[PDB]
Design a protein around this nucleic acid. Structure first.
Ligand SMILES: Nc1ncnc2c1ncn2[C@@H]1O[C@H](COP(=O)(O)OP(=O)(O)OP(=O)(O)O)[C@@H](O)[C@H]1O
Ligand SMILES: Nc1ncnc2c1ncn2[C@@H]1O[C@H](COP(=O)(O)OP(=O)(O)OP(=O)(O)O)[C@@H](O)[C@H]1O
Ligand SMILES: Nc1ncnc2c1ncn2[C@@H]1O[C@H](COP(=O)(O)OP(=O)(O)OP(=O)(O)O)[C@@H](O)[C@H]1O
Ligand SMILES: [Mg+2]
Ligand SMILES: [Mg+2]
Ligand SMILES: [Mg+2]
Lengths: 441, 112, 398, 104, 401
DNA sequence: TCCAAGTGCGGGGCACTCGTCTGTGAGGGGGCT
DNA sequence: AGCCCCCTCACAGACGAGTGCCCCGCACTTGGA
C-alpha cells in the first residue's frame, strides 16, 4: 500500500516538529532584535553587557536564546572570537559545581579534558586571575545563566558578585544573560549585586491573549509546509550543524511530501478549524491556559491518534481530547473505590456537614457508620478490621489528610469539596439503594 | 536488629553488609558502598551459576520503627523476581499487632 | 507499535485502551517520544506489571534502552542516578562514577547516536509519590530530561495520587496524564475467569474423584462459581490479587460435594460469609506474668478514668495521659496484696513499654525525673480477658 | 533622595496612626503607593521599593527582620521621631504627609 | 599531566593566560560619534580625575601620606552606599602615591589588596595577602604563621605595606578572628601596616563587631554621601566631553530621575548607554528627550500590571476572587477553600463555568511560579495558604481599564 | 626507574544554636451548695 | 468549708535557618626501594 506510508510520514513529521525544533520562534520582533544586537555588540566591539530575560513559564525564553545563537554562530566572526558558557540553576545546585563547569567549559589551564584539580578557592582564584589577565584583545565569554533565581539563592551570591564584577571592569569582555521566570528576581539580589547589574530587562509575555491568534497558531502547527521552505530549513539546520541541541534536531530535509497530499491536508485542517466544535474546544483550552506548551501537548496527543484506519483529523477527535483534558481526576478516583470506602466517605461528609469542617477520627466515623450498618440490611456484619483497612486505603490515596498517638485516635481532615462527592454519587456504577438513600440525608 | 535500624538508609546498609559478610564468613567493604545495586551485582556474579535464598531475620518485630519497617518491606518486595528474599519475623505479642502495624499497601505484598 | 499491543493483549485482559494509548505514545522507537507520561490508578490496577511487561517487550523487539526504578530505594539522589546510569549505559562495571545531576546529564549526552538506528530510552519510576519528599531538584529535571540530555527518551511515572499533589512553588513542565480505571464486576469476573486453564490443570494434576473432576469443572461451572463469589465479596474490595488468592481457597472448599458425589449456595455460603471476616488478612492467648497483668489493667484504669475520679474510687477523646507515679499508686490501690517496690516491677513497666502495650506520648528523656508521660494502648475485651483469668472485675472500677 | 524621604514619611505616619508595631514591606508599599498617588509623584515597583528600604537600612534608621518571602520582611524603626524630623530637613513636606492620614 | 601543572600553578611559575581573538579588534576611526559616546559612557572606564569627589580625595590622600611619611601604621574606615566613588577614590589616591614614590618625592611602599566578596571563607584572606607578597599559594595555616613571623618581628629595613580591604562585612563571622588579626597587626610597632577598610553600612563597628575590634578599628572614619541632582549631571557631562550628542535636558532628566531614587552613578551611566542604544535604532545622531524617557521607562520597569493583563481568563477570575476574599475576611493570608468558593460565586456571576480544583491548583501553581501570589507546595490541597503578592489595586487597574 | 603508607588538606554529614512559635499542666485566682 | 472551674505562663515541642565542627576520602609524596 501507499496511502499508509504517507500518513506515517505525516505523523512522524508533525510529532518531530511538535517535540523537537528548538531554534525556531514565532513573533517577538523587538525582543529578539534587542538580544541579538546586545550579543553582536559584545562580540564585535568588545563591550560588557548584562541582560535578564523575564517571562512566564511556558513562553519562548530558551527558544529565543537558541534562535539568536543559531543565527549568530555561523557568522565566522562570532564563532571564532567568542566562547559560550551555559549554566543551569537546576543542575549546578552549588557554587563549586558551577565553578568546575565554568573551568571545564572555558578550557582553562587546569581543565585537563573534564577533570578540574584544586579546591573551590583555588578554582575561584585561578578563574578571576585568568579573567583579570585579559582585555579587549581577548576572546569574549558569553555566560548564559538559566534559572537565575536558583543562582540568587546561593551562598552570599558570591559567584554572581564575580560575574557582575568583570562586566563593570576593564577585563575580558564577558556578557551575562540571565533567564528566569520570577518577575521579581531583582529583589533577591544584595545591594552590591543590585548596583553591579545593568538594569535592562526584556519581558517575554506571550502575544496570543486574543483567541484569533490562538487559532492561527493551531492552524500553523498542523499544516504541512512546501518543498522550498523545507530545503531552506534543512540548509539552515545543516549550516548550524556543520560547526547542545543540533546533534538531535528537527532537520526536515528527510521528509518530502507530494503537493496534492499537502493541499488535501491543509484543506482538511482549514475545514476542521473553520467549524464550531473545534473552536469550542480551543476556546475552552484558551480560557484555561494561553501558553504554548499546553497547546503543543494537546496537539501532540491529538496527532498521536492518527491511525491508518481513521487517517484524517476531524472535529470529534478534538472534542474527545478536549473532554480528556477538561475532566477531573479525584472524581475518577472516587468512582473506583469500593462500597465500604464510599459509605465511610459519606459518613465523613455527614460529620463535616454537621460539625462545619471539624477534624474527625476513626472512632467517630466508625460510630456514625455503625449507626447505619446495623439497619442497612446489606452491610450488617462487617467488622472493625475491614473498616480500619478501608480507612487506611482512604488515608494512602490522600482523600484524608492528617493534621500536620495511635492510628485509631489520630485526627484527620477531609480533602474534598462537597460537589465532588455529589458528582461521585451520580457517576458511581451499581450503587445500591440504601447507600443512595443515606447519602441524600 | 532494631538498634541498628533507626533510619531506612542504615537498615539497608545493615542488611547488605550482613549478607555480604555472611558470604565472607561462610567461605572489607565500607558501609558507604552498601546498597542494593552492589548486592544485586554480587548475587548475579556469585550465585547465578548454581537458587540460594536470602533470609532476613527480624528478632524484635515490636521494637522496630513503623515507617522504616514499611519502607523495608516495600524495598524487599520491589526486588523480588531478581533476588529471592525470604522474611521471617520475631513477633512477641500476637498476630493482631502484625495486622495493626502493617497498612493496606504494605500487606498487599505479603504472604505470611 | 501494533506488535507490542498484540503481545500484551493476551497477558492483560480488559486493559485494552491503556495498551492502545501506550502504543500510540511510546510504541514505536522511530517516532519521537513525549516528554513525560504519568499513568496512575488505585492499588491492584496493574500498572507496575503493565509497564514492566511493556518495557521488556520494547527492549526485546526494538533498539530501546529501558530502565525501571522504585523511589523508596532512592533515599538520596546518588543511588538513583547510579541505578539509572547502570540501566541506561550497560556493561560499564564498577568504574561508573556519578556525583550529582550534572555528571548524569553529561554521561547521558555522551550516549547520543545517529539518525538511522532509531534508538530510544525508557525510564519507569515506580512509587513516584516519594519523588516530592527528596532534594527537590530531581522532579523538574526528570520532567525535562529529554530537553536537557537532547535524547529520544520518555520518563514514565507511576503513583496512586493525581498529578495535582506534585506541583511545587517553582512550577513544573508539561506532562501526559493517563488514568488506569479500576474494573467493575463484569471485567473483574472476566479477569478471575482468565485462569480457568491453570485451575483445570491444577485440579487434574492432583480414582473416580479425578474422573468426575474432569467432566464438570468447565467454563460455565467456573462462571457460576465466580458469580456466586463476586455476589458476596465485591462489597468489601474490588482489588484483583486479593480476590484471586481468596477465590482459589473458596474454590478448593467449594468443590468437595461435587467430588464427594442451586444445590451449592448454602454449603459455600457458610464458609464464604465465614471468610468475608478473614479478608485483608494474608494468613495462609498472650501469656503475661501476674504483676505485669495488674500493671497493664492499672494503666488501662489510669487512661480510661479522669484525674478527679481517682480520689473517689481508690481511697477505700482517646486514652488520657498519666505519669508513672499515678500508675504505681493505682496498682498499689487495686492490688490488695501489698508487695514491695523492687527492681523487677519497674523492669516490668519498662518491658511493657518495649512490648508496645504502653507508650511514651511525651517526655521520654526525663523518665527518672518524673515528667515523662505514659499512654495505654489496649482495648476493653483484652482487659476483661485478663481480669477473667486473674479474677479482678474491671467493670466495677470504670 | 526623594523616594527615601517619602518612605520615611509613610513609616512615621504608620507608626503614629497605628498601635501595633509590626510593619511589613507590602503594607508599607501599599500605603506609600497611595501617598505617592496623592502627591502626583511617580511611585516605584515593589522590586525597587525593597532596594530603597535596603539603602535606608545602611544609614541605621531601620532594621529589617528577614522572613521567607520579600513581602513579609519586618521594618523596625530604630530612631526617635524627632531625630527623623531633624534628619530629613524637609519640614513643609514632612508636615504635609503626617497630616495626610487618609491613605492608612 | 596533573602533577607538574599543579606544582607549577601552586608555585606561581606559569602565566595564567587567556585565549586571543583570531580577528583583530576594531579601530577608533571606524567608530561613529554616537559609538564614541557609547564607549565613553561605560562604567569600566574610570577617569584620571574624579569630578565631585575632591574633598574625600584630599582627606584620604592627607591621611595616607601622613601614615607613610611617619612610618607608624594605622587604620581607617570609609563607608557609603554602593556607587558613590569609594574604591575609585581609594585606588586613585594609591596610584597618586605610587607615582609620587616613583619620582623620589615619597618613601616607597607596597600595596596589597583583598576583597571579601571573592573569598570562599574569610581565612582564605591569609592565602591571598601572602599571594600578593611572594607569589606562592600555600594553605591558610602556613600563610598565617608566615604572616605572623613577618609582621610581629622587627627586620630593618622594612618597607611600609598599605593593605586595602574591600567588603569588610564578609570577613565578619561568629568568631571574628580574621578581622581581629587584620586590625591587630597595625597595633604592633614592628609592623608598618596601614589598613583602610571599605564598607557600605555607616554603623558597622557598632552593629556586629565585638568590643576589642571596634576599639582597634579607631575613630578616623569617613562617609561618602550619595550623589545629588547637580553632581550626577556633572559626572555625565564630563564623561561625554565636548560632543553635542546628548542634549542638556536629556542629561538633566537622567540625573534628576536617578538621583531621586538611590544616588547611584552606575544607574545613570547605564541609563545613558541604554538611551544611546535606543537612539541608534531610530537612525538619528542625537539623544533627544524621547529616547531618554523611553530608556527611563525600560530600565526602571514595572511590569506587574502587564502581567495581569496578559494572564488567561481563569487566572484573572482567580486574582479577583483572592482580592475579594482578602476584602471579606480582613486578614491577608487566605486558604484555598474560601478562594475557590469566591471563585465559584464570581464564575456564577460572569456565566463562564470554572474548572474543578484539580485544575485550580494548577492555576495557583502557575501564579506562584510567576510570583503574582505566594503559595505553598500543592501536596496539601484545599488547605494551602495563599498570600497576594501584587497589590489589590493593581488588579482593579489591570482589569477595569 | 618506581612505591607504601603516613599525611595534609578539602568537603560533606551532622550536631548544636539562636530565634520563633505554639500547646499546655499545673499553680493561681474567682466563685460555690 | 473545703471544693469546682477558668487564666496564664514559662517548660515542651517543633522547626527552621544556619553555622561551625569532625570524620573521611584522597591526592601528595617522599624517603626509601
Ligand atoms: N514564541 C514561540 N515560538 C515557537 N515556539 C514556542 C514559543 N514559545 C513557546 N514555544 C514552545 O513552547 C515549548 C517550551 O518553550 P521554552 O523551552 O522556551 O519554555 P521555557 O521558558 O524554557 O520553560 P522554562 O522556563 O520552564 O524552562 C517549546 O516546545 C516551544 O516549541
Ligand atoms: N487486567 C489484568 N489482567 C490480568 N491480571 C491483572 C490485571 N490487572 C492486574 N492484574 C494482576 O495484578 C498484579 C499486578 O499488581 P501490581 O504490582 O501492578 O500492583 P500495583 O498497581 O503496583 O499496586 P501498588 O501501586 O499499590 O503497589 C499482577 O500480578 C496481575 O496478575
Ligand atoms: N565621581 C565620579 N566620577 C566619575 N566616575 C564615577 C564617579 N563615581 C563613580 N563613578 C563610576 O561609577 C563606578 C563606581 O565604582 P565604585 O568604585 O564607586 O564602586 P563601589 O562604591 O566600590 O561599589 P561597592 O560600594 O558596591 O563596593 C566606577 O566604575 C566609576 O567609573
Ligand atoms: Mg528555559
Ligand atoms: Mg507498584
Ligand atoms: Mg568597591
Amino acid at each position: 500500500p501507499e496511502a499508509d506510508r504517507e500518513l506515517v510520514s505525516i505523523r512522524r513529521f508533525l510529532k518531530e516538529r511538535l517535540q523537537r525544533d528548538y531554534t525556531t520562534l514565532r513573533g517577538y520582533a523587538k525582543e529578539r532584535s534587542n538580544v541579538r544586537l546586545l550579543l553582536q555588540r559584545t562580540a564585535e566591539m568588545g563591550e560588557s553587557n548584562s541582560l535578564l530575560l523575564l517571562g512566564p513559564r511556558g513562553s519562548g525564553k530558551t527558544t529565543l536564546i537558541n534562535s539568536v545563537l543559531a543565527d549568530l554562530l555561523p557568522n565566522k566572526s562570532f564563532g571564532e572570537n567568542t566562547l559560550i558558557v551555559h549554566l543551569d540553576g537546576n543542575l549546578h545546585t552549588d557554587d563549586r559545581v558551577a565553578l568546575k563547569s565554568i573551568t571545564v567549559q572555558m578550557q582553562l589551564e587546569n581543565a585537563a579534558d573534564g577533570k578540574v584539580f584544586g579546591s573551590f578557592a583555588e578554582n575561584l582564584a585561578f578563574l578571576l586571575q585568568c579573567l583579570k589577565a585579559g582585555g579587549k584583545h581577548s576572546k569574549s565569554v558569553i555566560f548564559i545563566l538559566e534559572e537565575f533565581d536558583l543562582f540568587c539563592a546561593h551562598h552570599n551570591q558570591t559567584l554572581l558578585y564575580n560575574l557582575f564584577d568583570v562586566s563593570q571592569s576593564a577585563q575580558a569582555p564577558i556578557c551575562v544573560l540571565g533567564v528566569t521566570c520570577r518577575l521579581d528576581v531583582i529583589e533577591l539580589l544584595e545591594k552590591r549585586v543590585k548596583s553591579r547589574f545593568s538594569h535592562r530587562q526584556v519581558f517575554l509575555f506571550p502575544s496570543l491573549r486574543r483567541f484569533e491568534d490562538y487559532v492561527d497558531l493551531c492552524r500553523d502547527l498542523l499544516s504541512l509546509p512546501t518543498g522550498n521552505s523545507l530545503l531552506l530549513a534543512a540548509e539552515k539546520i545543516y549550516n548550524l550543524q556543520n560547526i547542545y541541541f543540533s546533534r538531535n534536531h528537527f532537520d526536515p530535509g528527510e521528509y518530502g511530501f507530494s503537493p496534492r497530499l499537502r493541499d488535501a491536508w491543509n484543506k482538511q485542517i482549514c475545514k476542521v478549524l473553520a467549524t464550531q466544535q473545534a473552536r469550542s474546544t480551543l476556546q475552552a483550552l484558551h480560557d484555561f491556559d494561553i501558553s504554548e506548551a499546553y497547546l503543543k501537548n494537546f496537539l501532540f496527543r491529538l496527532v498521536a491518534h492518527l491511525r491508518p484506519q481513521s487517517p484524517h483529523i476531524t472535529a470529534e477527535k478534538m472534542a474527545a481530547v478536549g473532554s480528556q483534558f477538561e475532566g477531573d481526576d479525584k472524581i475518577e478516583l472516587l468512582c473506583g473505590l469500593s462500597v465500604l470506602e464510599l459509605c465511610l466517605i459519606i459518613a465523613i461528609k455527614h460529620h463535616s456537614q454537621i460539625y462545619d469542617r471539624d477534624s474527625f477520627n476513626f472512632e467517630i466515623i466508625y460510630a456514625r457508620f455503625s449507626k447505619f450498618a446495623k439497619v442497612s440490611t446489606t452491610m450488617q456484619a462487617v467488622e472493625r478490621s475491614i473498616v480500619l483497612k478501608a480507612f487506611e486505603h482512604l488515608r494512602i490515596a490522600e482523600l484524608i489528610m492528617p493534621l500536620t498517638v495511635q492510628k485509631e485516635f489520630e485526627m484527620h481532615k477531609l480533602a474534598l469539596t462537597y460537589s465532588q462527592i455529589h458528582h461521585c454519587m451520580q457517576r458511581y456504577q451499581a450503587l445500591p439503594t440504601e447507600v443512595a438513600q443515606w447519602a441524600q440525608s | 536488629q532494631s538498634r541498628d535500624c533507626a533510619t531506612l538508609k542504615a537498615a539497608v546498609e545493615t542488611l547488605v553488609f550482613g549478607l555480604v559478610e555472611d558470604n565472607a564468613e561462610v567461605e572489607r567493604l565500607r558501609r558507604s558502598q552498601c546498597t542494593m545495586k552492589q548486592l544485586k551485582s554480587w548475587y548475579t556474579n556469585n550465585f547465578d551459576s548454581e537458587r540460594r535464598q536470602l533470609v532476613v531475620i527480624l528478632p524484635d518485630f515490636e521494637c522496630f520503627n513503623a515507617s522504616v519497617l514499611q519502607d523495608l518491606i516495600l524495598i524487599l518486595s520491589a526486588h523480588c523476581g531478581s533476588l529471592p528474599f525470604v522474611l521471617v519475623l520475631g513477633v512477641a505479642t500476637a498476630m493482631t499487632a502484625v495486622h495493626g502495624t502493617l497498612p493496606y499497601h504494605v500487606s498487599s505484598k505479603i504472604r505470611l | 507499535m501494533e506488535a507490542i499491543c498484540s503481545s500484551l493483549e493476551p497477558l492483560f485482559p480488559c486493559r485494552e485502551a491503556a495498551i492502545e494509548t501506550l502504543g500510540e505514545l511510546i510504541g514505536d522507537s522511530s517516532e519521537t517520544y513525549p516528554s513525560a507520561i504519568y499513568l496512575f490508578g488505585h492499588s491492584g490496577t496493574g500498572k507496575t506489571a503493565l509497564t514492566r511487561a511493556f518495557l521488556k517487550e520494547c527492549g526485546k523487539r526494538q533498539n530501546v534502552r529501558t530502565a525501571h526504578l522504585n523511589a523508596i530505594e532512592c533515599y538520596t539522589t546518588k543511588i538513583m542516578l547510579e541505578i539509572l546510569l547502570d540501566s541506561l549505559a550497560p556493561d560499564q562495571g564498577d568504574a561508573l562514577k556519578v556525583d550529582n545531576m550534572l555528571d548524569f546529564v553529561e554521561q547521558l549526552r555522551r550516549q547520543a547516536a545517529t539518525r538511522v538506528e532509531d534508538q530510544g530510552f525508557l525510564i519507569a519510576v515506580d512509587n513516584a509519590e516519594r519523588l516530592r519528599d527528596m532534594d527537590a531538584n530531581v522532579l523538574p529535571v526528570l520532567l525535562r530530561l529529554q530537553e536537557l540530555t537532547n535524547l529520544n527518551l520518555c520518563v514514565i511515572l507511576l503513583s496512586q495520587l493525581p498529578f495535582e499533589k506534585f506541583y511545587n512553588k517553582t512550577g513544573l513542565s508539561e506532562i501526559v496524564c493517563l488514568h488506569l480505571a479500576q474494573y467493575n464486576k463484569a471485567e473483574t469476573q472476566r479477569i478471575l475467569g482468565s485462569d480457568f486453564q491453570q485451575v483445570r490443570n491444577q485440579l487434574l494434576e492432583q480414582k473416580k474423584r479425578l474422573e468426575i473432576c474432569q467432566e464438570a469443572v468447565t467454563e460455565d461451572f467456573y462462571n457460576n462459581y465466580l458469580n456466586l463469589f463476586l455476589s458476596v465479596f465485591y462489597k468489601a474490595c474490588r482489588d484483583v490479587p486479593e480476590l484471586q488468592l481468596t477465590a482459589r481457597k473458596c474454590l478448593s472448599t467449594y468443590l468437595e460435594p461435587v467430588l464427594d458425589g442451586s444445590r451449592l449456595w448454602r454449603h459455600i455460603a457458610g464458609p464464604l460469609r465465614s471468610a468475608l471476616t478473614q479478608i485483608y488478612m494474608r494468613i495462609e492467648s498472650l501469656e503475661l506474668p501476674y504483676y505485669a497483668k495488674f500493671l497493664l489493667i492499672a494503666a488501662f484504669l489510669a487512661s480510661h478514668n479522669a484525674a478527679k475520679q481517682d480520689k473517689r474510687l481508690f481511697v477505700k477523646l482517646g486514652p488520657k495521659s498519666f505519669s508513672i507515679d499515678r500508675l504505681l499508686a493505682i496498682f498499689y490501690a487495686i492490688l490488695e496484696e501489698k508487695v514491695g517496690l523492687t527492681c523487677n516491677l519497674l523492669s516490668q513497666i519498662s518491658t511493657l513499654v518495649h512490648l508496645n502495650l504502653l507508650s511514651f506520648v511525651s517526655g521520654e528523656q526525663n523518665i527518672m525525673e518524673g515528667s515523662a508521660r505514659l499512654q495505654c494502648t489496649i482495648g476493653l475485651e483484652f482487659v476483661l480477658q485478663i481480669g477473667k483469668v486473674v479474677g479482678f472485675n474491671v467493670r466495677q472500677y470504670l | 533622595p526623594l523616594q527615601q524621604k517619602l518612605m520615611l514619611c509613610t513609616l512615621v505616619l504608620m507608626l503614629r496612626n497605628e498601635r501595633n508595631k509590626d510593619i511589613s514591606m507590602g503594607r508599607l508599599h501599599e500605603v506609600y503607593r497611595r501617598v505617592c498617588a496623592k502627591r502626583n509623584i511617580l511611585a516605584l515597583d515593589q522590586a525597587e521599593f525593597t532596594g530603597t528600604v535596603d539603602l535606608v537600612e545602611t544609614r541605621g534608621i531601620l532594621r529589617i527582620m528577614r522572613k521567607k518571602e520579600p513581602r513579609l520582611h519586618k521594618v523596625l524603626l530604630q530612631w526617635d521621631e524627632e531625630e527623623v524630623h531633624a534628619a530629613l530637613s524637609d519640614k513643609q513636606l514632612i508636615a504635609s504627609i503626617l497630616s495626610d492620614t487618609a491613605c492608612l | 599531566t596533573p602533577s607538574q601543572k599543579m606544582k607549577k600553578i601552586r608555585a606561581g611559575e606559569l602565566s595564567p593566560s587567556m585565549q586571543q581573538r583570531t580577528d583583530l579588534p576594531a579601530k577608533d576611526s571606524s567608530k561613529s560619534e554616537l559609538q564614541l559616546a557609547r564607549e565613553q559612557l561605560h562604567v569600566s572606564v574610570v577617569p584620571k580625575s574624579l569630578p565631585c569627589r575632591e574633598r574625600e580625595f584630599e582627606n584620604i590622600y592627607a591621611f595616607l601620606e601622613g601614615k607613610i611619611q611617619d612610618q607608624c601604621g594605622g587604620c581607617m574606615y570609609v563607608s557609603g552606599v554602593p556607587g558613590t566613588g569609594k574604591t575609585a577614590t581609594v585606588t586613585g589616591v594609591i596610584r597618586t602615591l605610587q607615582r609620587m614614590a616613583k619620582q623620589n618625592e615619597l618613601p616607597a611602599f607596597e600595596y596589597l589588596e583583598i576583597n571579601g566578596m571573592r573569598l570562599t571563607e574569610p581565612r582564605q584572606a591569609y592565602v591571598q595577602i601572602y599571594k600578593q607578597l611572594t607569589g606562592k599559594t600555600v594553605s591558610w595555616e602556613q600563610a598565617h604563621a608566615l604572616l605572623e613571623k613577618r609582621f610581629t618581628t622587627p627586620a630593618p629595613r622594612r618597607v611600609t605595606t598599605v593593605l586595602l580591604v574591600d567588603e569588610l562585612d564578609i570577613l565578619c563571622n561568629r568568631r571574628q578572628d580574621v578581622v581581629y588579626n587584620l586590625l591587630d597587626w597595625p597595633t604592633k610597632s614592628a609592623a608598618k601596616l596601614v589598613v583602610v577598610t571599605i564598607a557600605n553600612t555607616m554603623d558597622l563597628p557598632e552593629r556586629l563587631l565585638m568590643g576589642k575590634v571596634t576599639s582597634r578599628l579607631g575613630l578616623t572614619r569617613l562617609t561618602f554621601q550619595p550623589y545629588s541632582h547637580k553632581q550626577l549631571q556633572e559626572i555625565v557631562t564630563a564623561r561625554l566631553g565636548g560632543s553635542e550628542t546628548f542634549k542638556g535636558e536629556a542629561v538633566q532628566l537622567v540625573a534628576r530621575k536617578v538621583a531621586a531614587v538611590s544616588g547611584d552613578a552606575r544607574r545613570a551611566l547605564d541609563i545613558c548607554r541604554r538611551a544611546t542604544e535606543i537612539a541608534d535604532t531610530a537612525a538619528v545622531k542625537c539623544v533627544t528627550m524621547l529616547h531618554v524617557q523611553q530608556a527611563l521607562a525600560e530600565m526602571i520597569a514595572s511590569a506587574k500590571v502587564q502581567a495581569i493583563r496578559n494572564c488567561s481568563r481563569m487566572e484573572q477570575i482567580f486574582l479577583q476572587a483572592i482580592a475579594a476574599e482578602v476584602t471579606r475576611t480582613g486578614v491577608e493570608e487566605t486558604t484555598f477553600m474560601g478562594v475557590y468558593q469566591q471563585v465559584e460565586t464570581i464564575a456564577a456571576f460572569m456565566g463562564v463555568t470554572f474548572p474543578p480544583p484539580g485544575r485550580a491548583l494548577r492555576l495557583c501553581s502557575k501564579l506562584g511560579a510567576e510570583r503574582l501570589i505566594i503559595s505553598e507546595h500543592s501536596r496539601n490541597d484545599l488547605f494551602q495558604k495563599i498570600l497576594l503578592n501584587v497589590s489589590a489595586d493593581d488588579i482593579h487597574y489591570a482589569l477595569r481599564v
